[PDB]
Amino acid sequence: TQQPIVTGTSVISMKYDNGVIIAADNLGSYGSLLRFNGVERLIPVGDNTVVGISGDISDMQHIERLLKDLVTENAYDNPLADAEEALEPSYIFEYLATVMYQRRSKMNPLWNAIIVAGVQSNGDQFLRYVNLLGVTYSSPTLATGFGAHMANPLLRKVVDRESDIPKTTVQVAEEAIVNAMRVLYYRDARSSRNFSLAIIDKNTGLTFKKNLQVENMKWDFAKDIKGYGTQKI
Amino acid sequence: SDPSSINGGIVVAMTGKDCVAIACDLRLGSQSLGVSNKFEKIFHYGHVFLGITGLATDVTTLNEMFRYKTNLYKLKEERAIEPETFTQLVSSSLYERRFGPYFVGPVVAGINSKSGKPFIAGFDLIGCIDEAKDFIVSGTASDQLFGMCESLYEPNLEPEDLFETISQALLNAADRDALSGWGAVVYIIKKDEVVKRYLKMRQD
Amino acid sequence: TTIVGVKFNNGVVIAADTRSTQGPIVADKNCAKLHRISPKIWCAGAGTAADTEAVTQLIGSNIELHSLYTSREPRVVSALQMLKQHLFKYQGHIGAYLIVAGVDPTGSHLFSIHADGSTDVGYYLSLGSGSLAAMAVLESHWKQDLTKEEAIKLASDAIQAGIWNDLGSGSNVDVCVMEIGKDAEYLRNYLTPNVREEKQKSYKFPRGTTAVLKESIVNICDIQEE
Amino acid sequence: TTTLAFRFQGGIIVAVDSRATAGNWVASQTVKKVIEINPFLLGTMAGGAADCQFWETWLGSQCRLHELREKERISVAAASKILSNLVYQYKGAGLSMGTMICGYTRKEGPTIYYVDSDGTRLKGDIFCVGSGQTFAYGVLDSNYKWDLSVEDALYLGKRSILAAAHRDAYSGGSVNLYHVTEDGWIYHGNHDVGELFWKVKEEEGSFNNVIG
Amino acid sequence: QFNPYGDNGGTILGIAGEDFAVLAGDTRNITDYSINSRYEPKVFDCGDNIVMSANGFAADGDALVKRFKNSVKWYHFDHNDKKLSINSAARNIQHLLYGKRFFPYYVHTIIAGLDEDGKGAVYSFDPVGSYEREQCRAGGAAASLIMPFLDNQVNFKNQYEPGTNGKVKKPLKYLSVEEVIKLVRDSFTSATERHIQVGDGLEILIVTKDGVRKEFYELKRD
Amino acid sequence: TSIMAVTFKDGVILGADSRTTTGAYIANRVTDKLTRVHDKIWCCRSGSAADTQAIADIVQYHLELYTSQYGTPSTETAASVFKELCYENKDNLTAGIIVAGYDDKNKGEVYTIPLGGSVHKLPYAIAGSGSTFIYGYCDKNFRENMSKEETVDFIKHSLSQAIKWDGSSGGVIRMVVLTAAGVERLIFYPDEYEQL
Amino acid sequence: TSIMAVTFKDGVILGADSRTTTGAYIANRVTDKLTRVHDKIWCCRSGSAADTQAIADIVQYHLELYTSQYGTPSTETAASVFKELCYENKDNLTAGIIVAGYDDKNKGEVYTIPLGGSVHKLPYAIAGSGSTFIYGYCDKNFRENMSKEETVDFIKHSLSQAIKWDGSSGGVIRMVVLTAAGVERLIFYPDEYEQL
Amino acid sequence: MDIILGIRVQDSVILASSKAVTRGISVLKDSDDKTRQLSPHTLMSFAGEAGDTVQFAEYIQANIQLYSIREDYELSPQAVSSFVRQELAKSIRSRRPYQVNVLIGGYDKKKNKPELYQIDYLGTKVELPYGAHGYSGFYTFSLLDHHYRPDMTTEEGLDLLKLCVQELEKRMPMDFKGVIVKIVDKDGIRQVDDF
Amino acid sequence: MDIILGIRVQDSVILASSKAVTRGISVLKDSDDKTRQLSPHTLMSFAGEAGDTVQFAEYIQANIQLYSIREDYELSPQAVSSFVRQELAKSIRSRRPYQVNVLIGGYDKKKNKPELYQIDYLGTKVELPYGAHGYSGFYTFSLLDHHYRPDMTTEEGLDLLKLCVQELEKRMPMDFKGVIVKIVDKDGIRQVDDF
Ligand SMILES: [Mg+2]
Ligand SMILES: [Mg+2]
Ligand SMILES: [Mg+2]
């Protein structure tokens, strides 16, 4: 048992017709102090998987090293390491889920909520969540912490059931994700303006966008707002 | 220690065609100990019926209180109180004890004598009004009653059909609650006759 | 509960879902969370249902008496001030979280108020367990210069977010529109996206199914003549 | 819960109720609170359901191994003591058990040991355990004789569970009856308390307080 | 202070037919007032004609189901591909649960299948492994909303024959699989109306001598 | 909250962020924390929104009644009324208020009233959770008798930093200018102040 | 504590105050919080003195043994050894450490290790209770590739402010310069830095 | 105070009440009468917190004696029991509530019926053929449920009570030093001085 | 388990121990023998936490029976009481300590003397003319302090005990269902089967 110290906020994600999108801001908070501003919380594994992590950053860095070490290990005595016997998203997720549940069972959790996003060998989209309790679930949209409350409802308007996935293009999905990140920036006090976004497409592979910003913000109406009830000036 | 489940008991009420039905079990206990099998929880003031579940001293006290208030109401207004009005009086009275409440779940049932409309309503311990078309549930087996009513109920049942439905909803809900049972009564209420039937049920 | 308020061109609109819960149980599937304070001042309430109802009627009563005393139509800032000073005095123990809106001689107004008596001003607001689902929609689709039709749509879209995504909210959407120079139109069950499907079976019983010990005619009549 | 067991001329009667609750909510009315350890030994279930089930079927295994190794039926004294010694090892960890280990052997005669999760092991003639125990004791204490016929003893046990099921909110459902002879136990049926109450009221003239 | 348990909601229901068995469960997965997933399956085919659901804390539920499936796998290796009977499965699961008596799997488990005479069978477990064979059992969030209904509409409790006035019970006639599915759907539809954690979808696994079949129905998503 | 008030050559300027918070949720991102208790006596509010609003409403009432009887109150008088409320009710309030006003004899004045209800007259003051991060900056960059533009820049830059580091603070930067020339409201949006 | 480390054109400088505290009592007013784990890899210590000393002593042992076997360790390697200790023993440590070193290939480098035992490579870092008050100042005044004198001034001015506001900090300002030219110790007394 | 019992037979009400008074570690008394005559045909037994029991009993007694004088008339047992319920229900929301449980046994001379009322400290009232407070009912109710008849004689009631007290003496951990038994019928209140 | 007494007279040791066993609310048994014979001329009575009492008593009994066989010889009461003290003193700093108090009454055949040893769960040992554990001494020690003589006969000891038990039956709140009395002298251990 510990308490999280340096933390990362929401990770949000969804399926579209040919793949998955996942996104997370570049902030490492220290309570209400916005301490660290260049923190990458999306970690690609191979070129078919991206692992998005929220919660304690020291524990994130530990998981990050487990994943790098996993790639090394898979290559050993493996002539098909960059082919049929490469690491799948489903393999990477199950390994993490195993670790998370074991760690909660020893009363010493990795204080995180993790989303694993990717595309399988056969082109099927993979999207699954696991957290500090070893709880796991899948859904056409997934989000952690704050994102579960504000991003999910927006992303669910785009993809509301399984049948909506073939109907959703990468442009529409990216637009929805980018818009959700703006909303989270308006409303979550532990969010930052800067974020990373990654698309794992079954045709175009893995696109990983760094240094994105929330833009097209509506603030103008602020000037018309005076007092808290009766004040006119 | 939780006042609303020291004594146990349940009340359910339903609407049908030109009639309402209100029913209750007869148990009073001190937790595990059954104490009385004749503790009726439905009272009436003129043609307005009031069932009350919860802490038994408050049940008794509130009946005595609404008898007091409806009696004075009648003397001044020169007419019997209607269900809609009584519902508001119950709500008012409970909220007046907002920070030291009576630990009860009251249920009102009756037919408006002018319009002929059948009426039911439920309250939380602090006066909030639930005015439902279909049914109202209250007491330590309220979850079970919600389950029964939600599938058993259909609208516009004839008095003697409604009787079977409300009786079955009560009985089977009581049999899945340790603190309810030990007898049961069902009131079938029409505009100018009210029939009260005691049910035969298991006594454990 | 999900409640919202949205300003438009010539007035203000409020909406709300219709679910009230006792813990995980739905007590009422069609609850009325839109309250009239005066003919053209309505407020949506979340929190403790008895508190939102009671505090709304008390202030409503006093507003009526005030209106009669001053020979003027009541203003929203009066309802706001009376509500907040009452709620503040009770230091949050009266669990009423309200979106207060209306039209009066001064114009159209939209406020919200927390149980501790803190207030705010805005063109769009939301409160309750579904407020985050709703606000996400408001922050996504709100713009300046909404028409009446656009605001009703936005408001009920925000209530739908709550209905679908928040377990504390569900069933139907109620709306009330307060436009300058017109009667307020309270639109009870403006939407009905949750009708229960037909059951597989009828559970109507054969008569005589239930065991009975005694019957008696209960005398509801007063004492009789002759 | 109400469970009893008593010694008499004809062996041992064991009688239990059938109810299980999670707070006020009645989870089941069809729980088998008599554990058939083996064809000659019975145990009752009070306190922890799993603790009683798990460790008393475990006990059956230890009893089987004993008579394979010793070529002789295990004594009730020895069988009960295996269970009590086991639970005593776990003392403090949070086991919950109140049970009567019942058997009829050649050397001992009919024997009941009350065994308990904080280590108590008591030989006795009459034992009642559970939330309804006080009610069952009352009927037992005023009608018990060593010279009860097997038929009357079976009824007394049934009637005592009935008394508890009526008054105790946490006892009810049905009564399960067993007669323990030297040649083994004999099951004497499941008796719904609903139907049993009305039958007993009529035939006995008891429960005048209740309208039927 | 770290709390190793959570509550993912959900409601499940198992009914033993004369020569079949059903195990139903909703597909909604929740934490507090949020929906994690509208379709997260909860009832599983475990091989040897056994279906299983471990409801409550999903992490513990998943771990148990995984371990039981694995138990079946090794039963085959160790006992010459012998078929694991439902009663044997039940006893095995007791030992799985009780093995964690002092740090329990926070779940209410139900399994279903056929016994060795081909009769329908359901078994129910508490978190630490006490278990009963049962005809009819709901578990999880809306269990209390469902069981009293089933008592009345499956076992005909409190129903008597018209005319006899209480002297003659409504007789306990035998139910078909289509008749049972009707009661399951009405059970979950009613539960959906009144319990906030029940909804989204209903998935039913049916077990006959011919194997394991699936049926799925939408539920209200509010 | 990040709030501050700064005296300069022609009077005083008040400044604030616009974030109201219930835990991590931003309940209001366009809050007005600069409140008017008299024509040219304003305050900055930090702490409980309920408490600071209730206090300001009462102070406004006292100063309106003061005015009717004795004419325009001094900024010192306004600060004293605030203090009386904050000091006598210290056990039930969470309020850190900066009072700022413009007299014609006394010119610009600033009084800060921290949690305990003490009063402190200063050339400038900073308060709210965000203030902690700009004690260094503000102490190094404040001089007396700045011009209107220099003072606007000081506040803009200061609150920009406070907002940058304090997650509780954010939104727009509001300012209120108090001089002989009247009362001027100012607003600065994220894209202006963030890049500073 | 007020501690910081700053990379510049010729390498890196570490800086610290000299106050050790047991409650309000200053247990040591001339503490050396700049500690050497290798010839040109040093650290700044904040948190429990017992914990940070024990950690530094162990790290120095590991890097001495590393050196004997594999030659001079990188600054990154030193930071990793610190992290391993701080991360694996997070439940029993109160230690916020800044690691700073000079390679010839990598030049000046700075790694900060906060309470949880995470690692963060930065151009400069600040930590200790006093750091909170200079987030604004340091963010506004740091540029990359400063000269030795500009960097000495930056640290002097920064820690001066941190000391001014944080009662936990105080005493002398110690600095350690790490370049190709060797290792230089610096000290600045109250009368110099207070008046800045 | 510990055990108090009541039973209503054909034509009388019988109250039995334990004689022991315990101050923690020692039994201070073994002949304590836990009863007060409210009117010539109404008796009230009591048990609960030390001091409050007698204070409450005597307070009620004074009020009923006052009523009797003012109206020159004896209140019915139902009326007395309602007054007593109200006083306890009043008290339960007080600053310091009476922790007292009572049985009221009266013979109604108007209806010629014996009546037994059970009222706990919350003001929870119930008319009964037989009753008890605390743990007493747990041991005795199964015997009374078996043997009780509405048409029992006073001596059949005493025999059933004798059996009830024997079960208590067998299975209760506490030595309550026997019971004082009192009978309430058409001729008033008398004490059975041997039990 | 509640009351256990010991008295050492001229030529024997007498142990009296209550017969009741209570599981919270009910008396489960009224004929429980709270004693174990350790050797032909040594008896140990015990009281304390449920389960631990018998577990401890039987453990000691086995160890002494083992010693007797190995050496073909009976340990002196002093020796047995020292072994027992050590085991309790061992246990008091254990993970889960034995909550057991004991009286050891033996006749030393070498010195031809009766001996009574009092040992509490902490392993606090004391040789005494008479002794008790728990609350028993509080009621009885003033009688024993008055009437006890070193040269009493076995029957004078039993009469003094009869008086001690009567005081307990008068003033103790708990019904302990009488005592079983056992005598330890030169001829071994026997039970007084009427008390
Ligand atoms: Mg019962
Ligand atoms: Mg919903
Ligand atoms: Mg200092």
Amino acid of residue H74? E
| Class of the domain covering D1-212 | alpha beta
The answer for C 121-140 residues in CB contact with F (under 8 A) is: 121-122, 132
Q: Which 8-state DSSP code applies to residue I80?
A: H
Query: Which member of A4, A36, A58 has the closest CB to residue G87?
Result: A58
CB-based contact A44:A208 (threshold 8 Å): yes
Q: What is the 3-state secondary structure (H, E, C) of chain A?
A: CCCCCEEECCEEEEECCCEEEEEEECCEEECCEEEECCCCCEEEECCCEEEEEEEEHHHHHHHHHHHHHHHHHHHCCCCCCCCCCCCCHHHHHHHHHHHHHHHHHCCCCCCEEEEEEEECCCCCEEEEEEECCCCEECCCEEECCHHHHHHHHHHHHHCCCHHHCCCCCHHHHHHHHHHHHHHHHHHECCCCCEEEEEEEECCCEEEEEEEEECCCCCCHHHHHCCCCCCCCC
Question: How long is chain I?
Answer: 195
Whether residue E59 and residue A133 make contact (CB cut-off 8 A), yes or no, is yes
Please give the angle made by the CA atoms of E17, E20 and E25, to the nearest 5 degrees.
80
Ligand nearest to the CA of D172: 1
CB-based contact G86:G73 (threshold 8 Å): no
- Domain coverage including residue E102: 1-222
Helix residue spans in C95-186 (DSSP H): 131-141, 148-165
Assign residue E50 a region: left if phi > 0, alpha if psi is -120 to 50, beta otherwise? Answer: beta
What is the CB-side half-sphere exposure of residue I79 using CA atoms within 13 A?
Answer: 15
CB-based contact E28:E198 (threshold 8 Å): yes
Which chain F residues touch C121 with a CB distance below 8 Å? Answer: 32
Pick from E53, E23, E12, E54: which is nearest to E180 by CA? E23
Secondary structure of residue E207 in the 3-state scheme: strand
Domains and CATH numbers, chain B: 1-204 (3.60.20.10)
Query: Which member of E144, E158, E166 has the closest CB to residue B147?
Result: E144
Q: How many CB pairs under 8 A join C and E?
A: 73
The number of beta carbons lying within 10 Å of the beta carbon of residue E172 is 9
Alpha-carbon G25 to chain mean position: 23
Which chain B residues touch E186 with a CB distance below 8 Å? Answer: 151
Pick from H135, H4, H176, H134: which is nearest to I172 by CA? H176
| Block residue for tokens 């035939």 | D203
Whether residue B127 and residue C212 make contact (CB cut-off 8 A), yes or no, is no
User: Catalytic: which of G1, G21, G31, G151?
Assistant: G1
Rg (CA), chain A: 19
CB-based contact C27:C58 (threshold 8 Å): no
Burial C160-199 (b: 16+ CB within 10 A, else e): bbbbbbbbbbbbbbbbbbbbeeeebebbeebbeebeeeee
Secondary structure of residue H82 in the 3-state scheme: helix
Q: Give the C-alpha separation, F3 to D75, whole Å.
A: 85
Are β-strands C34-38 and C25-28 bridged in parallel, bridged antiparallel, or unpaired? unpaired
Q: Is A129 on the interface with E (CB under 8 A)?
A: yes
How many angstroms separate the alpha carbon of residue G168 from the centre of ligand 3? Answer: 6
**CATH number of the domain that E195 lies in?**
3.60.20.10
Q: Give the C-alpha separation, A164 to C135, whole Å.
A: 24
Helix residue spans in chain E (DSSP H): 58-78, 86-98, 143-153, 177-194
How many angstroms separate the alpha carbon of residue F129 from the centre of ligand 3? Answer: 21
Q: What contacts E89, CB < 8 A, 6 or more positions away?
A: E46, E48, E50, E68, E72, E111, E113, E123
A15 token code pair: 């399926």
Gaps after residue numbers in chain I (C–N over 2.5 angstroms)? none
Secondary structure of residue C144 in the 3-state scheme: coil
Q: Give the C-alpha separation, B185 to A101, whole Å.
A: 53
User: Catalytic: which of D1, D2, D99, D105?
Assistant: D1
CB-based contact E22:E112 (threshold 8 Å): yes
Q: Which 8-state DSSP code applies to residue H49?
A: S
Pick from A12, A7, A8: which is nearest to A129 by CA? A12
Please give the angle made by the CA atoms of C74, C79 and C80, to the nearest 5 degrees.
135
Domain count, chain H: 1
Amino acid of residue C222? D
Let me know if C1 is a catalytic residue: yes
How many angstroms separate the alpha carbon of residue D114 from the centre of ligand 1? Answer: 24
Give the residue from E126, E147, E152 with the most D CB atoms within 10 Å of its CB, the best one to mutate.
E126
B71 token code pair: 């009696």
Query: Which member of D116, D121, D133 has the closest CB to residue I26?
Result: D133
Considering Cα of B191, then B194, then B199, then B204, what sign does the dihedral take? positive
Pick from A55, A61, A11, A39: which is nearest to A177 by CA? A11
What is the CB-side half-sphere exposure of residue I183 using CA atoms within 13 A?
Answer: 19
Pick from C42, C52, C76: which is nearest to C186 by CA? C42
Q: Which 8-state DSSP code applies to residue F102?
A: E
For D52, D63, D100, the CA distances from D116, given in Å and listed in that order, are 10, 19, 9
The number of beta carbons lying within 10 Å of the beta carbon of residue H171 is 22
Q: Give the C-alpha separation, B145 to B137, whole Å.
A: 6
Q: Give the C-alpha separation, G117 to G111, whole Å.
A: 12
The number of beta carbons lying within 10 Å of the beta carbon of residue G64 is 12
Please give the angle made by the CA atoms of F48, F49 and F54, to the nearest 5 degrees.
100
D49 marked as binding residue:
yes
Q: Give the C-alpha separation, I119 to I99, whole Å.
A: 12
Q: Cα distance from D106 to chain E (closest Cα, Å)?
A: 33
Q: Give the C-alpha separation, B48 to C178, whole Å.
A: 38
Domains and CATH numbers, chain C: 1-226 (3.60.20.10)
Alpha-carbon I39 to chain mean position: 14
Which chain H residues touch B61 with a CB distance below 8 Å? Answer: 89, 123
Q: To what resolution in angstroms was this structure determined?
A: 2.7
Considering Cα of C150, then C154, then C156, then C157, what sign does the dihedral take? positive
Domain locations along chain G? 1-196
Considering Cα of B29, then B31, then B33, then B34, what sign does the dihedral take? positive
Nearest CA in chain H to I172: H26
The number of beta carbons lying within 10 Å of the beta carbon of residue H70 is 8
CB-based contact C80:C119 (threshold 8 Å): yes
Domain count, chain A: 1
Q: What contacts H168, CB < 8 A, 6 or more positions away?
A: H3, H136, H139, H140, H176
Q: Is H146 on the interface with D (CB under 8 A)?
A: yes
Whether residue C144 and residue A228 make contact (CB cut-off 8 A), yes or no, is no
**DSSP strand E in G103-164: where?**
108-113, 120-122, 124-127
Which chains pack against D, by 3+ Cβ pairs within 8 A?
B, E, H, I
| DSSP H/E element including H57 | helix H52-71
Q: Cα distance from E218 to chain A (closest Cα, Å)?
A: 11
In degrees and rounded to multiples of 5, residue G11 shows phi and psi of 150, -120
Q: Which 8-state DSSP code applies to residue G129?
A: G
Pick from F143, F171, F131: which is nearest to F26 by CA? F171
Pick from E53, E30, E32: which is nearest to E41 by CA? E53
Q: Cα distance from E91 to chain C (closest Cα, Å)?
A: 34
**CATH number of the domain that I171 lies in?**
3.60.20.10
Q: Which 8-state DSSP code applies to residue E176?
A: P
Which chain E residues touch D54 with a CB distance below 8 Å? Answer: 94, 98, 101, 129-130
Q: Is G155 on the interface with F (CB under 8 A)?
A: no
How many angstroms separate the alpha carbon of residue C173 from the centre of ligand 3? Answer: 60
Q: Give the C-alpha separation, I4 to B24, whole Å.
A: 55
Q: Give the C-alpha separation, D36 to C64, whole Å.
A: 76
The answer for E 89-148 residues in CB contact with B (under 8 A) is: 142, 144-148
**CATH number of the domain that A192 lies in?**
3.60.20.10
CA dihedral H51, H53, H54, H59 (to 10 degrees): 120
Whether residue H145 and residue D206 make contact (CB cut-off 8 A), yes or no, is yes
Considering Cα of E170, then E172, then E177, then E181, what sign does the dihedral take? positive
Pick from G92, G139, G131, G134: which is nearest to G115 by CA? G92
- Domain coverage including residue A60: 1-233
Q: Name the architecture of domain G1-196.
A: 4-Layer Sandwich (3.60)
